[PDB]
Symmetry: C2
Subunit: 161 residues, 2 copies
């Protein structure tokens, strides 16, 4: 079998790639449907090796292989994004930047977020046979703590908390 590396964006929207295969170097157009998961097998007849003149070329087997996305991790029909944010924003509030698979979607969080927080939002992957409907967007936070604080900051913190 021959692996077919695709991206989450190509799996999100859809794409008709042009892969190169040698059996004699030819280019085969392979369509990608939204929602396809890893392991998906595709077979193209005639694109394989020919054993003899008196027989036609064999088939070509491809296996969907998703590449690592710099901003997302896939969990079935859900997407997960790690966002590094300063402790102060986690306690007081802030709007989170989200460059979806395609636009910019600003998500303002007001409530207190902690290391175990999982903000669940239709902003994940498209669900099979359900037009316009997508999975949930899970927001995970990487709260950055101050390296050090002055004696006065600590006093104010104790008074505040």
């Amino acid at each position: 079998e021959v692996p077919l590396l695709v991206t989450l964006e190509e799996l999100y929207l859809g794409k008709r790639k042009k892969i190169k295969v040698t059996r004699e170097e030819n280019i085969v157009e392979v369509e990608i449907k939204p929602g396809w998961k890893d392991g998906t097998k595709l077979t193209y007849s005639g694109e394989g090796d020919q054993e003899s003149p008196g027989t036609s070329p064999g088939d070509l087997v491809l296996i969907i292989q998703t590449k690592t996305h710099p901003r997302f991790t896939r969990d079935d029909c859900h997407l997960i994004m790690k966002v590094t944010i300063p402790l102060v924003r986690a306690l007081t509030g802030f709007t989170c930047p989200v460059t979806t698979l395609d636009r910019n979607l600003q998500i303002p969080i007001k409530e207190i977020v902690n290391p175990k927080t999982r903000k669940i939002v239709n902003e994940g992957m498209p669900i099979k046979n359900q037009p316009g409907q997508k999975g949930d967007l899970i927001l995970e936070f990487d709260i950055c703590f101050p390296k050090s604080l002055t004696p006065e900051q600590k006093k104010l913190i104790k008074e505040a908390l």
Copy 2:
């Protein structure tokens, strides 16, 4: 012949060493039938021994045929889960649960050692979810060099407040 049997010990026993009576069982032919015969043996647990340490008791194993000499019994040190510490090589790790205010402003951390000593450790620097505070010589004894010990490693489980009034947040903004 020979077979292995777990010997369950506690971190307290591996820290202080312990001499005690252990009950073992093995196959023996009695009146033409195989029986599970219990016997009592003594074991001396040495400070610092690690999991996997094998103790071979010659002749305490299973008997294959009547009259023939019994094989050997092999005991393997296995450490029971401790409610306070996790052993890491020669170190001891302890997870301390604290409120966010203390993580940011300081506090004093109590620790009861395996030999029942009572420590009160000051935490002066800011601690965060990834902090690993190393406390010298408060780990396990090192089998190789006697008198020596590894370290105590303090990690923290910081509880964030569930809510904060608008006045409190404004104060936090000013502070941080």
